[PDB]
Amino acid sequence: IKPRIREILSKELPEELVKLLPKRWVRIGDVLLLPLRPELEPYKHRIAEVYAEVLGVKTVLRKGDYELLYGSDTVTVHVENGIKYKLDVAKIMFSPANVKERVRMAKVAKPDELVVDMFAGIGHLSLPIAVYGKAKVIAIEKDPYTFKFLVENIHLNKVEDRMSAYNMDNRDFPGENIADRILMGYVVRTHEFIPKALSIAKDGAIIHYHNTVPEKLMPREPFETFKRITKEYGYDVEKLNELKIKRYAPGVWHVVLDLRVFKS
Ligand SMILES: CSC[C@H]1O[C@@H](n2cnc3c(N)ncnc32)[C@H](O)[C@@H]1O
């Protein structure tokens, strides 16, 4: 609400700085992500404080991982498309920059499927599936801290019946030829996980494969590379779909490819 923020802060800021105040922000649970121009640095705390008041949030992080500008408690529960996502906003990446994809996941699975989430996080991609798809889900998350939330989110959504969780590196995962669908929501050279994926996959399984490719190499990549690694195993793969996502600089998109693999 500009007027109120303006009314309060104009009382302490040069009108010149006033004009520069944040016009937008991101909100996650009761935590605010707030972007700030350089020339406002001296006043950052007071600014975050009044925005906290009028926007009704407990804590403010700098949007620009994140600097604490006001408050202390960065844990919160964020509700999206009917799903409760508990997280620690400061320590765990989560962005409505990717809400479309989480919505999509709500519309892909059939209740029979076994799905394996190789980079579960707090359940970003898997929860939508366990709730709307009604399919079974095994979810793997390496970080013990992240893992706590993943677990908690399973209860918060009343799916503990059809969704399990392991705090381990996906590489050490025992299952093989068990997955009808695989989630690979990771972006740091995800291609190094293709082999384990192919191992976990059943013949014909669908894989949601995320990664970050320079647009220079598009649309050859990232598929070519996926294709060739798969060849190393005598398996074949068909590209069903390629969506672009949080395309981000410099010069590299974040894409997701929907692929089917054939174990011959
Ligand atoms: C939240 S999006 C990416 C997620 O995958 C997790 N992750 C990264 N590498 C692995 C791995 N090798 N096995 C299981 N989870 C992983 C991260 O800790 C994070 O929560």
Curated annotation (Swiss-Prot):
<feature type="binding site">
    <location>
        <position position="95"/>
    </location>
    <ligand>
        <name>S-adenosyl-L-methionine</name>
    </ligand>
</feature>
<dbReference type="InterPro" id="IPR056743">
    <property type="entry name" value="TRM5-TYW2-like_MTfase"/>
</dbReference>
<dbReference type="GO" id="GO:0005737">
    <property type="term" value="C:cytoplasm"/>
</dbReference>
<comment type="similarity">
    <text>Belongs to the class I-like SAM-binding methyltransferase superfamily. TRM5/TYW2 family.</text>
</comment>
<keyword id="KW-0963">Cytoplasm</keyword>
<protein>
    <recommendedName>
        <fullName>tRNA(Phe) (4-demethylwyosine(37)-C(7)) aminocarboxypropyltransferase</fullName>
        <ecNumber>2.5.1.114</ecNumber>
    </recommendedName>
</protein>
<dbReference type="Pfam" id="PF02475">
    <property type="entry name" value="TRM5-TYW2_MTfase"/>
</dbReference>
<keyword id="KW-0808">Transferase</keyword>
<keyword id="KW-0819">tRNA processing</keyword>
<keyword id="KW-0949">S-adenosyl-L-methionine</keyword>
<dbReference type="InterPro" id="IPR030382">
    <property type="entry name" value="MeTrfase_TRM5/TYW2"/>
</dbReference>
<dbReference type="Pfam" id="PF25133">
    <property type="entry name" value="TYW2_N_2"/>
</dbReference>
<comment type="function">
    <text>S-adenosyl-L-methionine-dependent transferase that acts as a component of the wyosine derivatives biosynthesis pathway. Catalyzes the transfer of the alpha-amino-alpha-carboxypropyl (acp) group from S-adenosyl-L-methionine to 4-demethylwyosine (imG-14), forming 7-aminocarboxypropyl-demethylwyosine (wybutosine-86) at position 37 of tRNA(Phe).</text>
</comment>
<dbReference type="GO" id="GO:0016765">
    <property type="term" value="F:transferase activity, transferring alkyl or aryl (other than methyl) groups"/>
</dbReference>
<feature type="binding site">
    <location>
        <position position="102"/>
    </location>
    <ligand>
        <name>S-adenosyl-L-methionine</name>
    </ligand>
</feature>
<dbReference type="GO" id="GO:0006400">
    <property type="term" value="P:tRNA modification"/>
</dbReference>
<dbReference type="GO" id="GO:0008175">
    <property type="term" value="F:tRNA methyltransferase activity"/>
</dbReference>
<feature type="binding site">
    <location>
        <position position="141"/>
    </location>
    <ligand>
        <name>S-adenosyl-L-methionine</name>
    </ligand>
</feature>
<dbReference type="InterPro" id="IPR029063">
    <property type="entry name" value="SAM-dependent_MTases_sf"/>
</dbReference>
<dbReference type="GO" id="GO:0030488">
    <property type="term" value="P:tRNA methylation"/>
</dbReference>
<feature type="binding site">
    <location>
        <begin position="169"/>
        <end position="170"/>
    </location>
    <ligand>
        <name>S-adenosyl-L-methionine</name>
    </ligand>
</feature>
<dbReference type="InterPro" id="IPR030867">
    <property type="entry name" value="TYW2_archaea"/>
</dbReference>
<dbReference type="GO" id="GO:0102522">
    <property type="term" value="F:tRNA 4-demethylwyosine alpha-amino-alpha-carboxypropyltransferase activity"/>
</dbReference>
<dbReference type="InterPro" id="IPR056744">
    <property type="entry name" value="TRM5/TYW2-like_N"/>
</dbReference>
